[PDB]
């Protein structure tokens, strides 16, 4: 494979299909303090049409995390009557991205027309960075989907209570706070809430994992919620506080469109329902840069040296090990990203005044000698097969004398 480092994941559907399919890829490297770093991302989705293979190939083009957060594929080769409009690649922040596909519609180009039936097997995501390394993620579906093409009617519960408060959802995560219109006293408790997000041919249902609390605490009494769909790693839940109710359903997807409604049904035969409009914010909730630890290395002489330890303690004596380094806030993509090392690779050509070699135990030692009189930051990223990728912020600062 073109991939030099791949890791796999398992995706299973909880509840009924809400109308979209969601998969999260957290480990792709998004280099910090680099407003010029980009990435080439293709996606291949593997189906089975009649027990026979069929691949759909999609290209999202070049990613610009500093400017754009939502992407649609530029081209589709497996083909569909309109494959590109049914896909979305969204950045979630902190180096994480989510790929979304609209179920209940056929993205595959070839149909006998006797097989309306089609099942999703796995998803391959290809990630090429500035250094040219090919990162891949393989998302195996625990149970084959067998998706059915349909047009669900859009209904409106036109008896609920409109709220001035608006629900905003950012990086697929909805957040909203509502007041309480509940006659029963807090001590009565036995309060249950059910949420439904309707709009643009997809419905989302969220419920209590543990059911009704039956105990109200003036202090907040939290509660986990499960939402129909492919659940995100981010826990989804809410809280009702004696006086207000806050909810965070995680799988909320942009395919709902604008002006979609969130319905909140609550009880405790007296029952109530509150509806609220939802809007999809276009700004990333936090920096897309991957988390990076900062280390201070002091040099009293122009030569300086840092040691890159083994990555994340995983795959000691790995088959593939890759170490990258570049200067903070680079301006030119054609020269600033040449400092790349591998076990087989020797001294890189375009790397200037930086040297590195793999000592026994793979302690990669970098000689950054060449700098002087200026506090400069070197961004070092190391990876290995089946070993999460770490990036180090190494600050080189001049020291007046030895032995302090």
């Amino acid at each position, epitope marked *: 494979l073109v991939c030099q480092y791949t890791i796999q994941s398992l995706i299973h559907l909880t509840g009924e299909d809400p109308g979209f399919f969601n998969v999260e890829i957290p480990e792709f490297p998004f280099y910090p303090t680099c407003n010029v770093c980009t990435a080439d991302v293709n996606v291949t989705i593997n189906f089975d049409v009649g027990g026979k293979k069929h691949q759909l190939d999609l290209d999202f083009g070049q990613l610009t995390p500093h400017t754009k957060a939502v992407y649609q594929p530029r081209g589709a080769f497996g083909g569909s009557e309109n494959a590109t409009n049914l896909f979305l690649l969204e950045l979630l922040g902190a180096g994480e991205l989510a790929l979304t596909m609209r179920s209940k519609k056929l993205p595959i180009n070839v149909t006998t027309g006797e097989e309306q039936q089609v099942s999703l097997e796995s998803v391959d995501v290809y990630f090429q960075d500035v250094f040219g390394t090919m990162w891949c993620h393989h998302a195996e579906m625990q149970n084959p989907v067998y998706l059915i093409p349909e047009t669900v009617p859009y209904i409106k519960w*036109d008896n609920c209570n409109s709220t001035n408060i608006t629900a905003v959802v950012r990086a697929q995560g909805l957040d909203v706070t509502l007041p309480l219109s509940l006659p029963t006293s807090a001590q009565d408790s036995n309060f249950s809430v059910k949420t439904e997000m309707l709009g643009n041919e997809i419905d989302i249902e969220c419920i209590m994992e543990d059911g009704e609390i039956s105990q109200v605490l003036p202090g907040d009494n939290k509660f986990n919620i499960t939402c129909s769909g492919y659940e995100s790693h981010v826990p989804s839940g809410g809280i009702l506080t004696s006086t207000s109710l806050r909810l965070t359903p995680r799988p909320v997807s942009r395919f709902l469109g604008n002006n979609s409604i969130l319905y909140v049904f609550y009880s405790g035969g007296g029952d109530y329902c509150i509806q609220s409009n939802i809007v999809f914010s276009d700004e990333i909730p936090a920096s897309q840069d991957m988390p990076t630890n900062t280390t201070d290395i002091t040099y009293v002489g122009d030569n300086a040296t840092y040691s890159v330890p083994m990555v994340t303690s995983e795959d000691a004596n790995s088959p593939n090990v890759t170490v990258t380094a570049f200067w903070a806030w680079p301006n030119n993509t054609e020269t600033d990203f040449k400092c790349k090392w591998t076990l087989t690779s020797g001294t890189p050509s375009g790397c200037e005044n930086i040297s590195g070699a793999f000592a026994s135990n793979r302690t990669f030692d970098i000689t950054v000698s060449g700098l002087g009189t200026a506090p400069k930051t070197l961004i070092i990223t190391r990876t290995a097969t089946n070993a999460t990728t770490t990036t180090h912020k190494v600050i080189f600062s001049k020291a007046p004398h030895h032995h302090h």
Partner: antibody
Amino acid sequence: QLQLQESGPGLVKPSETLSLTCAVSGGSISGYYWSWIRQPPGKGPEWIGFIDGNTVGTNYNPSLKSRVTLSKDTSKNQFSLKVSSVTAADTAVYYCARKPLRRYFWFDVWGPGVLVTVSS
Amino acid sequence: QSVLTQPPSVSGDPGQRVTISCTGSSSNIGAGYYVYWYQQFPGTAPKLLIYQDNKRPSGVSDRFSGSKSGTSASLTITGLQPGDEADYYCSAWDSSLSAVMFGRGTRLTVLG
């Protein structure tokens, strides 16, 4: 063997309020959705609206939203209907039917239906 | 009262097959929304005949089948029997009306 039985007055004066009740036996209101369909003689069925069996949720035909109210009593295992400002266009056989699934709109089990006539 | 277009009545020889056509628009049936068929003997509640375009409830005979291709659906009766004389109504949801639509209806008559 879930059965639906409609009840209510057979004659209502114009501009008054029509009111019926559907009694469900052999099954539970909870877990399903419940709808009202009317059919004037010689014409086809017309959908009115449905009520959620587990929430307060109601959906109405926009052509009748102004004058129609749907309610349910989980106790007594029944749900009701009310039509306001009834006219000669409102005389029909009224059917109460179960809507088994919320995503899709079909009615598997119906009641026998009760005729209501609107006349002075 | 907007309606889906149906033939008022269709005729058929016993033991043959006849077709009943339900025609809609891009708002209801052309949009891909599901089509439903109901059978109604005189003086009785409609009986769900075909649900989900072509699916058959447990009990309905295999002689009944459904089709949806295009902006119009179709209900087929094969091995036509005298007991099939009834009223047949199609149903589909309309996105432009936000309501469930029913057809004009069709009277099935057995010839000979």
